[PDB]
């Protein structure tokens, strides 16, 4: 086949900035390389085709260039709409193939989170199971990770972490990590730990209550 590989899956720059996205193909694709844009609501749109032709409706802020197997899309006056995910594709042969994409998230300062542990609700208890919820919010950059070490137990099995997207207002993320189980298996451990590894520290931030 013919694969399209984009150098980086994710990229972080600031408004007004200028950034360049790469895409190399597995073999000479003459100049049949097109670029598209996907926005958070799923819609896609042709940006540049045949390496560098600007499609009708695309601003001059977009530009393409390349030959052989390497191409580049360069966006010059970074605006607020331009913070979506971009894709490359070859029109040289069937099957048509695209690259993994590359997403633009806005660059900013660092922020460790505000961590909170919530003990299982009574109404749930008096039903069948018990979920422990750990909220980690408003931090940057997106990378954080967590282990549930309930005093020498790592309940990675049956955990649901969940990610938010770069909050509109202040550009951070937030993560929920739910550790749901049974009244039985909860009603014998009585010692639940929530560990959280983030840049800002080397000291793994841990939060708890023990009953």
């Amino acid at each position: 086949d013919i694969q399209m590989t984009q150098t980086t899956s994710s990229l972080s720059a600031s408004l007004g900035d200028r950034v360049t996205i790469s895409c190399r193909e597995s073999q000479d694709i003459s100049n049949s390389l097109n670029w598209y844009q996907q926005k958070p609501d799923g819609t896609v749109k042709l940006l540049i085709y045949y390496t560098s032709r600007l499609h009708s409706g695309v601003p001059s802020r977009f530009s393409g260039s390349g030959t052989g197997t390497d191409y580049s899309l360069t966006i010059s006056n970074l605006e607020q709409e331009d913070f979506a995910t971009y894709f490359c594709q070859q029109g040289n042969t069937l099957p048509y193939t695209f690259g993994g994409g590359t997403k633009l998230e806005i660059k900013r300062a660092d922020a460790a989170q505000t961590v909170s542990i919530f003990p299982p609700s009574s109404e749930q208890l008096t039903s069948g199971g018990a979920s422990v919820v750990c909220f980690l919010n408003n931090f940057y950059p997106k990378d954080i990770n967590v282990k549930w070490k309930i005093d020498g137990s790592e309940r990675q099995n049956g955990v649901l972490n969940s990610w938010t997207d770069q909050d509109s207002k202040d550009s951070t993320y937030s993560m929920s990590s739910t550790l749901t189980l049974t009244k039985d298996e909860y009603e014998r451990h009585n010692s639940y730990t929530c560990e959280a590894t983030h840049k800002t520290s080397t000291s793994p931030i841990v939060k708890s209550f023990n009953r």
């Binding site: 097109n34 598209y36 799923g42 819609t43 896609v44 749109k45 042709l46 085709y49 045949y50 032709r53 499609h55 894709f87 594709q89 029109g91 069937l94 099957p95 048509y96 193939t97 695209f98 690259g99 993994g100 994409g101 505000t114 909170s116 542990i117 919530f118 003990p119 299982p120 609700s121 109404e123 749930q124 039903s127 979920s131 919820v133 909220f135 919010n137 649901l160 969940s162 990610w163 938010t164 909050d167 207002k169 937030s174 993560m175 929920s176 739910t178 749901t180 209550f209």
Partner: protein, 212 residues
């Protein structure tokens, strides 16, 4: 000029779905593309359908269960899938084939589940006796055991619009689960009353859960 897809669609493994795409320009001049975008994945060309000769062409992984219909007189290109499997839920787009994928559609999100319309269980989350070691304080509402999507979650009918975070649903136990958090100052937390309102359209379920 625009292509309008159909969906969303709920299907159980085994049934078949027929997704449409209708247009606005000289239909038969340009063929039609079908693209499968799976969730944490990129885009993949499933294939074409030539509008004038009705001759389709398939990406090699999309042979067999996938077929290409098209009803010229109305200007709709179809795409049905037989023997629906898990593997098949994803957004499907149609983009006309040109000097690049010209115009796309909105996509149609197909979900395969054999799970029934289930109402949610909103449980309230609170610190309890945990001494608030901050001028901020945080609350949450846990929405678990529901199907399908989505649930709309507000705080005080919108009045509490900032400080809120409503996390993406996680598919566990074949049903969904999401959570939301609000963060309010140390004073209006208990004296004032903070409550979360969940509503599930499918099941006409709406419930308020007041917090400790």
């Amino acid at each position: 000029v625009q292509l309008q897809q159909s969906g969303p669609e709920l299907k159980k493994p085994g049934e078949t779905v027929k997704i449409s795409c209708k247009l606005w320009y000289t239909f038969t001049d340009y063929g039609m593309n079908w693209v499968k975008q799976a969730p944490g994945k990129g885009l993949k060309w499933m294939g074409w359908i030539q509008t004038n000769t009705e001759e389709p062409t398939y990406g090699a992984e999309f042979k067999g269960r996938f077929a290409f219909s098209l009803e010229t007189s109305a200007f709709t290109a179809y795409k049905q899938i037989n023997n629906l499997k898990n593997e098949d839920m994803a957004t499907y787009f149609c983009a006309r084939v040109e000097a690049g994928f010209d115009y796309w559609a909105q996509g149609t999100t197909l979900t395969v589940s054999s799970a029934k319309t289930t109402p949610p269980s909103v449980y309230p989350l609170a610190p309890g006796s945990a001494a608030q070691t901050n001028s901020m304080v945080t609350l949450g509402c846990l929405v678990k055991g529901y199907f399908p999507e989505p649930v709309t979650v507000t705080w005080n009918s919108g009045s509490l619009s900032s400080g809120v975070h409503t996390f993406p649903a996680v598919l566990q136990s074949d049903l969904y689960t999401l959570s939301s958090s609000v963060t309010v100052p140390s004073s209006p937390r208990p004296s004032e009353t903070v409550t979360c309102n969940v509503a599930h359209p499918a099941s006409s379920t709406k419930v308020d859960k007041k917090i400790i």
